[PDB]
Amino acid sequence: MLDFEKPLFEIRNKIEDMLEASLERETKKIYTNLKPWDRVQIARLQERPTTLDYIPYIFDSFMELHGDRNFRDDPAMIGGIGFLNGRAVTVIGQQRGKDTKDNIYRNFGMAHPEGYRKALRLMKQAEKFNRPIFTFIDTKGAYPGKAAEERGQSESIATNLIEMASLKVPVIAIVIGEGGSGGALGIGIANKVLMLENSTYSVISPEGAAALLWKDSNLAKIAAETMKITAHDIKQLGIIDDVISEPLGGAHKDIEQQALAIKSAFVAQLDSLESLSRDEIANDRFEKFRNIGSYIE
Amino acid sequence: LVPRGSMLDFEKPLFEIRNKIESLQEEIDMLEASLERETKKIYTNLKPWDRVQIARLQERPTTLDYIPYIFDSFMELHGDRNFRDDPAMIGGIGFLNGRAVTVIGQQRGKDTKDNIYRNFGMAHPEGYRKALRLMKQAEKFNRPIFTFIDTKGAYPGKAAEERGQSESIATNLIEMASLKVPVIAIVIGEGGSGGALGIGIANKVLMLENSTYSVISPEGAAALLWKDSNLAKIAAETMKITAHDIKQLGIIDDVISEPLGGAHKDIEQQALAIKSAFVAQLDSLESLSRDEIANDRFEKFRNIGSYIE
Amino acid sequence: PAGIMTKCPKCKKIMYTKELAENLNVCFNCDHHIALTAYKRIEAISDEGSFTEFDKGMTSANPLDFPSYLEKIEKDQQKTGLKEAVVTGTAQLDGMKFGVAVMDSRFRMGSMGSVIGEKICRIIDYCTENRLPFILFSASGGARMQEGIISLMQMGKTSVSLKRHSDAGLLYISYLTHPTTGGVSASFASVGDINLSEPKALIGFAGRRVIEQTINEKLPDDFQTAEFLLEHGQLDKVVHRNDMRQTLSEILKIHQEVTK
Amino acid sequence: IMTKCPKCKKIMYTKELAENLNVCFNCDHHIALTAYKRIEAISDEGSFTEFDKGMTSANPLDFPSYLEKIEKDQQKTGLKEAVVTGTAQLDGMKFGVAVMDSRFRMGSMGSVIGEKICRIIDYCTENRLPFILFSASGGARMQEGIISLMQMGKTSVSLKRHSDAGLLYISYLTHPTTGGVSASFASVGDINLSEPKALIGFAGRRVIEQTINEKLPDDFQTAEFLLEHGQLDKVVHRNDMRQTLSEILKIHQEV
Ligand SMILES: [Zn+2]
Ligand SMILES: [Zn+2]
C-alpha cells in the first residue's frame, strides 16, 4: 500500500451501497489525478512489469541472446531477436527482476559496462541485417561499482552514444520503469522515444538532487517536482515522442493490456520511419538530438 | 630462454679453438685466423635447431629495441578501452621517412625482471584487442601498419581464457583480413602459432633469418607425436620452422639476414636491414586502392594450402 | 550381439544404440551429449533428402614430406569411412537453404589441415556468391602438425573467406561442439554472428593441462565448458541437442532475405 | 600574488606558478588551469579565435534561483558559461578546441555547453579540422533536468559525424571528469589523454564506497589507474602537453 492510497484504506475500513460506490469513485479520482511523486512510487514498485514481462505479448518467436564477446553476460541487460507482426526485429533492454531473489540476480536492472557492450553488439547485428531495434529503458542507473569503473562504465556508455547516433536502422526506445540518467541514455539514443505515463526520465535521482541542492535527501519529492521528471513533462519539452497510458492503478494491474498499448505505439512509431533510407535514418537521429537544448544567443 | 653468456652447443668448436690459441708463434695466430674462419663457417651454415636457439636468446632484440632506429617521432599509446593495458603488446604512431604509420608488436622484455613485467611477450586477450584498436585507428587515418611478431605464443592462463583469448585472436584475423590500409608483418623472435598470427594477417610477411614460425612448439610436437619431449630438435626439423623453409612454401615474402652471430650482435645494423625491407615492401603496395589492398590480402591467405582434388 | 548397445562415457549406463541415436546421441540417463558423427549431425538439422555434399572426394597431400602422415590418414579413413575431418555442402531446413560444414573429431582429432581449410573456404565462398547463410559445426582437439606452418595458415585462409561472406551482409552461425580447442577455437569458431554450443562442450585456446601447469593452480570443474563461456560473454546460447533443430530453424527464418 | 598548493601547502608566486603552467614546483601537483590559460598554453600566440563567446543560459524548467546562480559564477570567473570554444593553431597547424572550466557551476553540462561544443565540432567537420576537447565536470546540471541529460546525446551525434568524416578527435580529460561528461565525449577520443592524478569516472568515490560497502584504493579513478585499466592512450605531464599535442597533430595532418 502506497501513501496516496491511504484515503482508500480509510474508506475501505468503514465498509469491513453508498460507500462502495464512493470508494470506486475515489479510486478513479486518485488514479486520474496522479501527482509527480505518486507516479515516481508507481515506477519504483517491485511489481512494475519488466522487459521480459512485455516481450511475449508484443513479439513473436523471441530468442534471447547472451554476451558481449568480451568479458561477461550481464544479467541486468537482456536482448535477442524476434518478429513484430512478421517483421524481423532486435529487442534489447534492462531487466529488473520480478522478485527479491531475482532482484539480486538482475542487479536491480543496474547494468555493468559488459551490459552496454552486449547491447551494442546486438544492435550492430540488427544493423548488419537491416532489422529495426526496440529498446526498453528500465533502470535506476548504471551500476556505481568498483568493478564497473575498472571495466570502463563511462566508456561503455559513451561508445553506445556515438555508435547508436549513426546506426543505419530505425531505433525506437520506451521507458517502462525509471529512466536513470546516462545509464538509461546508454540504450536511449533512438529515432523515437516513448514513455509509460508513470515512468520517469531524470539526469539524477530525486534523492541525489535533494541531498545536493538542499542538503536534505528527505526533500526528494520537491526535487522530483522541480526537475520535471514525469512522462508528460518530458513530452512537453519535445524530448520524447509520445506518452502511453497505463491501466488504472498502474502497468502492473494489467500487463497484457499494457503490452498491447506498447505494441500499438511501436507499430505507429516504426511506421513513421518507413520511407527513410539507411542514411536518412541516421540523419533523422542526428537532427533529433542536435536540436535539443535552450539557450540565449 | 637462453640466459646471457652461456655458450650454445653448436659453438663448441669455437670455444675448443679458443683455449688452445690461450695455451700458445707462427702457429698461435695460425689458430687465431682459423678461429675466425670457423666462426664464419659455423654462422654461415646454421642448422634449424641452431637458429631456434638463437631465436630464444634472452638478448634477442625486441620490438622496442628496433623501433627508434626505424621510425621517427614514435609515440607509444596504451590500452584496449575495455579492460587493461597489456604489457606484452605495445603499439603507437610515428613516421617512416616522413610518412605517418602505426606500429604494433609483442614486447618480450630485455632482462629477467623485464621478462616478468612483459609476460615474456605472451599476450592476453586485452593485448590483441589493443592491437586491433590501434589498427582501426590506422585504417581511419589511412596509415600503413607495421607489426612485430615476437612471441612463444598467446598466454595459456586462467584469466586469458576467462577474457576470451580465442575470441580476441579470431576477431583480429577477420578484422585484419579486410583492413583498407597496407599491413606489413615481420617475425623478429619466435612465431608462436595462433598468438603470432593474431597480429600476422598482413599483405606482406617478413622473417629474420634466425626467427621461427610454427603451428606448435618443437617441444609440444615432440611430446605429442613421439611422446618424448627430448626430441624437440627432430620435431623442429620435421615441421620445417625456419625462415628459409617458410619462404620456400611461399608463406612469407622475404628473409632478412642477420649480422654474423645473430641480430643481437648489431641491433643498429639489423634495424637498418628491417627498415630497408619495410620501405621496399610498402612501396610494392603503393598503387593499390583501399579496396584493392584488402583484396590483395584476401588472395594471399585464400590460396595457402596443398591438397588433392 | 555387439554394436546394438552403447555405454555412456560419463554415467556408464548401457543403452540401445538405436534409441540413443533417436535421442540425437544424448544419454537419456544423465543427459551427457555424446559425439555425433558428421552425417548424423547434418541429418538432424536438415529436411530429408535436401543435402548436397561438396568436394566429397578431396584428399590430403604430404607437402612437408612428414614421415608416416599419409599412412595415419589412411587408417582414420578406414576407421571412420570419411575422406577427411570435415563434411561440407548445402541443405535445407524447413525449406530454407543454407551452406554447412561439420567437423568430425574422430578423424585426426578434427585437427585442421589444408583439406579442411579448402573445403570450408569453398562452401563459404559458394554461400557468398549465392547469398546463403552458413553454419559451421566445430570440433577440433589439436593442430595438424604434420602440415606445419601450412596448418597454422588455414586459420587466416578460412578467415578471409568468412569476413568476405560477412561483409556481403550474410549470416554465419558458429556451432561449437565438443571439443573446440586451439587454432579452430581462435579462428572461425569464435566469430559467428551468433555463437551456439551444447551443454558441457569444452572450448578454449589452450588445454586444461597446459594451463594448470603454467599458472600452478587447479582449475574449477566447469572451466572452459559451454556454460562457462556463456557466463563469460562468449556464447549467444547453450542449446540442448533436442532444441538444436528448432533453434536453427528460427534463426534461419529471422534472417531469411526477402527473395526469388 | 601568492598561491598555496592545495596538496603540499607550499606557497608560490602566482606569476611563476602560471609560467610553470600551474604545476606545483615543490610537489608536482597539477593545479587547475582556467580555460583561457589552457588555450594559451597549447596554441601559437595570437592564433585563437573564440566562437559563440556571448551565448548565455536560459531557464527552460523555471528552476528556482538558477539564473541567479549563473550570474554569480559569471561575476566570480568572468566567464559567460563553463566552456570556451574556438579555433587556434599549434606550430602552424589549425584545430578546433573546447575547454571546460570546473570553476563555473562545477563544469556541469547544460544547454549552452552542449550547443557551443556542437557548433565547434560541426565547424571542424565542414572545414576538415581536428578537434581537441578538454573535459572538466564535477556533476550534473540538474537545473536543466532532462535537457542536460540529452546534451550527452546532442554532443555525441556531432562528434560521431566528425569522426565519420575521417577527422581526429583528441579527448584531453582534466581534473575532475565525472558523470555524464565522463560517460559521453570524454571517453571516446581517437586518442584519450589525461594529466597525472586527475580523477575520472562515472560515479563518485563516496557513492561507490557506500554502494559496495568497501574501501577503494588511493589511486582509484586516477589517470594512472585509467591508463592501467586500458582507458587512456597516455598520461601527460603538463611540461609535455604542448609538444605531445604538436606531435599528434603533425602525425594526423591530412595528406
Ligand atoms: Zn550418461
Ligand atoms: Zn605542491
mmCIF file of N, CA and C in Angstrom, chain A residues 94-156:
data_model
loop_
_atom_site.group_PDB
_atom_site.id
_atom_site.type_symbol
_atom_site.label_atom_id
_atom_site.label_comp_id
_atom_site.label_asym_id
_atom_site.label_seq_id
_atom_site.Cartn_x
_atom_site.Cartn_y
_atom_site.Cartn_z
ATOM 1 N N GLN A 94 17.013 -3.212 -20.219
ATOM 2 C CA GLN A 94 17.391 -3.533 -18.845
ATOM 3 C C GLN A 94 16.318 -4.410 -18.252
ATOM 4 N N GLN A 95 16.733 -5.402 -17.462
ATOM 5 C CA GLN A 95 15.819 -6.362 -16.868
ATOM 6 C C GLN A 95 15.928 -6.265 -15.331
ATOM 7 N N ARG A 96 14.877 -5.735 -14.705
ATOM 8 C CA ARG A 96 14.857 -5.508 -13.280
ATOM 9 C C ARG A 96 14.784 -6.723 -12.425
ATOM 10 N N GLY A 97 14.114 -7.766 -12.810
ATOM 11 C CA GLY A 97 13.941 -8.708 -11.669
ATOM 12 C C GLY A 97 12.536 -8.672 -11.073
ATOM 13 N N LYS A 98 11.881 -9.825 -11.109
ATOM 14 C CA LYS A 98 10.463 -9.909 -10.782
ATOM 15 C C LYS A 98 10.207 -10.062 -9.267
ATOM 16 N N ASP A 99 11.135 -10.667 -8.543
ATOM 17 C CA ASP A 99 11.022 -10.757 -7.096
ATOM 18 C C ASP A 99 12.349 -10.385 -6.433
ATOM 19 N N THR A 100 12.474 -10.716 -5.142
ATOM 20 C CA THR A 100 13.628 -10.336 -4.344
ATOM 21 C C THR A 100 14.873 -11.087 -4.792
ATOM 22 N N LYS A 101 14.757 -12.409 -4.906
ATOM 23 C CA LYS A 101 15.899 -13.239 -5.275
ATOM 24 C C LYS A 101 16.346 -12.863 -6.662
ATOM 25 N N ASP A 102 15.342 -12.594 -7.504
ATOM 26 C CA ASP A 102 15.544 -12.148 -8.864
ATOM 27 C C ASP A 102 16.205 -10.778 -8.918
ATOM 28 N N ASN A 103 15.923 -9.905 -7.946
ATOM 29 C CA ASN A 103 16.458 -8.532 -7.944
ATOM 30 C C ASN A 103 17.959 -8.589 -7.816
ATOM 31 N N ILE A 104 18.435 -9.469 -6.937
ATOM 32 C CA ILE A 104 19.866 -9.643 -6.755
ATOM 33 C C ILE A 104 20.537 -10.257 -7.983
ATOM 34 N N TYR A 105 19.895 -11.262 -8.558
ATOM 35 C CA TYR A 105 20.395 -11.818 -9.807
ATOM 36 C C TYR A 105 20.499 -10.724 -10.912
ATOM 37 N N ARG A 106 19.463 -9.905 -11.033
ATOM 38 C CA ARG A 106 19.432 -8.929 -12.114
ATOM 39 C C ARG A 106 20.152 -7.635 -11.727
ATOM 40 N N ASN A 107 20.755 -7.623 -10.536
ATOM 41 C CA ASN A 107 21.404 -6.425 -10.018
ATOM 42 C C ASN A 107 20.480 -5.211 -10.118
ATOM 43 N N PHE A 108 19.193 -5.444 -9.873
ATOM 44 C CA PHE A 108 18.171 -4.395 -9.862
ATOM 45 C C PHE A 108 18.047 -3.632 -11.213
ATOM 46 N N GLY A 109 18.396 -4.259 -12.326
ATOM 47 C CA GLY A 109 18.335 -3.573 -13.608
ATOM 48 C C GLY A 109 19.423 -2.536 -13.747
ATOM 49 N N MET A 110 20.460 -2.659 -12.900
ATOM 50 C CA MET A 110 21.627 -1.776 -12.973
ATOM 51 C C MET A 110 22.783 -2.444 -13.737
ATOM 52 N N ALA A 111 22.957 -2.039 -14.992
ATOM 53 C CA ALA A 111 23.979 -2.643 -15.887
ATOM 54 C C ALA A 111 25.439 -2.273 -15.541
ATOM 55 N N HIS A 112 26.325 -3.228 -15.806
ATOM 56 C CA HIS A 112 27.779 -3.061 -15.832
ATOM 57 C C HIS A 112 28.179 -2.731 -17.287
ATOM 58 N N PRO A 113 29.427 -2.275 -17.493
ATOM 59 C CA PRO A 113 29.871 -1.955 -18.867
ATOM 60 C C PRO A 113 29.646 -3.106 -19.858
ATOM 61 N N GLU A 114 29.879 -4.336 -19.406
ATOM 62 C CA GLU A 114 29.623 -5.532 -20.245
ATOM 63 C C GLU A 114 28.186 -5.590 -20.761
ATOM 64 N N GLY A 115 27.240 -5.052 -19.952
ATOM 65 C CA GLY A 115 25.821 -4.966 -20.339
ATOM 66 C C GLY A 115 25.649 -4.008 -21.519
ATOM 67 N N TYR A 116 26.270 -2.835 -21.424
ATOM 68 C CA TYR A 116 26.218 -1.888 -22.525
ATOM 69 C C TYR A 116 26.901 -2.439 -23.780
ATOM 70 N N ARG A 117 28.041 -3.120 -23.616
ATOM 71 C CA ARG A 117 28.785 -3.670 -24.764
ATOM 72 C C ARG A 117 27.996 -4.796 -25.461
ATOM 73 N N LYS A 118 27.271 -5.570 -24.668
ATOM 74 C CA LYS A 118 26.361 -6.587 -25.189
ATOM 75 C C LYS A 118 25.201 -5.936 -26.015
ATOM 76 N N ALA A 119 24.599 -4.887 -25.452
ATOM 77 C CA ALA A 119 23.559 -4.150 -26.144
ATOM 78 C C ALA A 119 24.103 -3.695 -27.492
ATOM 79 N N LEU A 120 25.287 -3.095 -27.488
ATOM 80 C CA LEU A 120 25.899 -2.611 -28.723
ATOM 81 C C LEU A 120 26.124 -3.725 -29.763
ATOM 82 N N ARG A 121 26.609 -4.870 -29.301
ATOM 83 C CA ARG A 121 26.913 -5.971 -30.186
ATOM 84 C C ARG A 121 25.591 -6.365 -30.873
ATOM 85 N N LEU A 122 24.520 -6.472 -30.073
ATOM 86 C CA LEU A 122 23.219 -6.853 -30.648
ATOM 87 C C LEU A 122 22.631 -5.826 -31.612
ATOM 88 N N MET A 123 22.850 -4.555 -31.333
ATOM 89 C CA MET A 123 22.411 -3.508 -32.212
ATOM 90 C C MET A 123 23.204 -3.498 -33.526
ATOM 91 N N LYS A 124 24.489 -3.835 -33.467
ATOM 92 C CA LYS A 124 25.311 -3.905 -34.683
ATOM 93 C C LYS A 124 24.906 -5.093 -35.535
ATOM 94 N N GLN A 125 24.458 -6.180 -34.880
ATOM 95 C CA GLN A 125 23.875 -7.336 -35.561
ATOM 96 C C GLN A 125 22.585 -6.899 -36.301
ATOM 97 N N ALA A 126 21.715 -6.169 -35.602
ATOM 98 C CA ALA A 126 20.478 -5.664 -36.198
ATOM 99 C C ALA A 126 20.788 -4.813 -37.422
ATOM 100 N N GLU A 127 21.764 -3.922 -37.278
ATOM 101 C CA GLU A 127 22.129 -3.035 -38.380
ATOM 102 C C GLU A 127 22.639 -3.816 -39.598
ATOM 103 N N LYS A 128 23.523 -4.795 -39.335
ATOM 104 C CA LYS A 128 24.030 -5.652 -40.423
ATOM 105 C C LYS A 128 22.909 -6.318 -41.232
ATOM 106 N N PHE A 129 21.888 -6.787 -40.536
ATOM 107 C CA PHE A 129 20.782 -7.468 -41.175
ATOM 108 C C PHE A 129 19.558 -6.550 -41.466
ATOM 109 N N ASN A 130 19.738 -5.233 -41.284
ATOM 110 C CA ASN A 130 18.708 -4.246 -41.535
ATOM 111 C C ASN A 130 17.426 -4.444 -40.698
ATOM 112 N N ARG A 131 17.572 -4.867 -39.446
ATOM 113 C CA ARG A 131 16.432 -5.036 -38.540
ATOM 114 C C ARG A 131 16.233 -3.774 -37.715
ATOM 115 N N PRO A 132 14.959 -3.339 -37.509
ATOM 116 C CA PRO A 132 14.708 -2.259 -36.571
ATOM 117 C C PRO A 132 15.083 -2.723 -35.180
ATOM 118 N N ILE A 133 15.405 -1.765 -34.329
ATOM 119 C CA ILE A 133 15.759 -2.052 -32.941
ATOM 120 C C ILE A 133 14.755 -1.406 -31.988
ATOM 121 N N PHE A 134 14.275 -2.197 -31.028
ATOM 122 C CA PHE A 134 13.414 -1.737 -29.957
ATOM 123 C C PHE A 134 14.140 -1.883 -28.627
ATOM 124 N N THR A 135 14.235 -0.798 -27.847
ATOM 125 C CA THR A 135 14.935 -0.858 -26.560
ATOM 126 C C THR A 135 13.975 -0.521 -25.423
ATOM 127 N N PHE A 136 14.140 -1.221 -24.312
ATOM 128 C CA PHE A 136 13.317 -0.996 -23.140
ATOM 129 C C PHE A 136 14.218 -0.411 -22.054
ATOM 130 N N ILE A 137 13.989 0.856 -21.711
ATOM 131 C CA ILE A 137 14.704 1.514 -20.609
ATOM 132 C C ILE A 137 13.996 1.252 -19.286
ATOM 133 N N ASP A 138 14.735 0.694 -18.324
ATOM 134 C CA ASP A 138 14.182 0.325 -17.071
ATOM 135 C C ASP A 138 15.323 0.196 -16.082
ATOM 136 N N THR A 139 15.781 1.339 -15.583
ATOM 137 C CA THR A 139 16.933 1.328 -14.702
ATOM 138 C C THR A 139 16.987 2.545 -13.780
ATOM 139 N N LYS A 140 17.256 2.319 -12.497
ATOM 140 C CA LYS A 140 17.596 3.459 -11.616
ATOM 141 C C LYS A 140 18.941 4.093 -11.977
ATOM 142 N N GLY A 141 19.774 3.359 -12.729
ATOM 143 C CA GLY A 141 21.014 3.926 -13.317
ATOM 144 C C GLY A 141 22.046 2.859 -13.563
ATOM 145 N N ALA A 142 23.091 3.192 -14.316
ATOM 146 C CA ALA A 142 24.194 2.234 -14.474
ATOM 147 C C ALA A 142 24.774 1.951 -13.073
ATOM 148 N N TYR A 143 25.293 0.753 -12.880
ATOM 149 C CA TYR A 143 25.818 0.357 -11.580
ATOM 150 C C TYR A 143 27.058 1.137 -11.136
ATOM 151 N N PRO A 144 26.977 1.843 -9.986
ATOM 152 C CA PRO A 144 28.144 2.563 -9.484
ATOM 153 C C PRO A 144 28.980 1.625 -8.595
ATOM 154 N N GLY A 145 29.772 0.780 -9.240
ATOM 155 C CA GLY A 145 30.601 -0.199 -8.533
ATOM 156 C C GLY A 145 32.081 -0.033 -8.817
ATOM 157 N N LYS A 146 32.893 -0.760 -8.037
ATOM 158 C CA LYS A 146 34.334 -0.824 -8.244
ATOM 159 C C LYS A 146 34.694 -1.508 -9.569
ATOM 160 N N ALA A 147 34.208 -2.728 -9.763
ATOM 161 C CA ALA A 147 34.455 -3.486 -10.974
ATOM 162 C C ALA A 147 33.895 -2.746 -12.206
ATOM 163 N N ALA A 148 32.727 -2.109 -12.079
ATOM 164 C CA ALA A 148 32.145 -1.324 -13.188
ATOM 165 C C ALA A 148 33.051 -0.204 -13.632
ATOM 166 N N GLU A 149 33.670 0.504 -12.681
ATOM 167 C CA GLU A 149 34.646 1.535 -13.034
ATOM 168 C C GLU A 149 35.920 0.988 -13.679
ATOM 169 N N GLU A 150 36.455 -0.090 -13.107
ATOM 170 C CA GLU A 150 37.623 -0.774 -13.688
ATOM 171 C C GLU A 150 37.374 -1.210 -15.120
ATOM 172 N N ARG A 151 36.172 -1.724 -15.384
ATOM 173 C CA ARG A 151 35.869 -2.216 -16.740
ATOM 174 C C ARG A 151 35.324 -1.160 -17.667
ATOM 175 N N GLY A 152 35.399 0.102 -17.244
ATOM 176 C CA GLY A 152 35.081 1.233 -18.151
ATOM 177 C C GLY A 152 33.583 1.484 -18.330
ATOM 178 N N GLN A 153 32.859 1.580 -17.219
ATOM 179 C CA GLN A 153 31.468 2.022 -17.228
ATOM 180 C C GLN A 153 31.236 3.230 -18.121
ATOM 181 N N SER A 154 31.986 4.292 -17.881
ATOM 182 C CA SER A 154 31.817 5.549 -18.674
ATOM 183 C C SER A 154 32.016 5.288 -20.171
ATOM 184 N N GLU A 155 33.087 4.579 -20.488
ATOM 185 C CA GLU A 155 33.438 4.258 -21.880
ATOM 186 C C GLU A 155 32.355 3.450 -22.587
ATOM 187 N N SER A 156 31.841 2.432 -21.897
ATOM 188 C CA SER A 156 30.819 1.557 -22.463
ATOM 189 C C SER A 156 29.547 2.332 -22.827
#
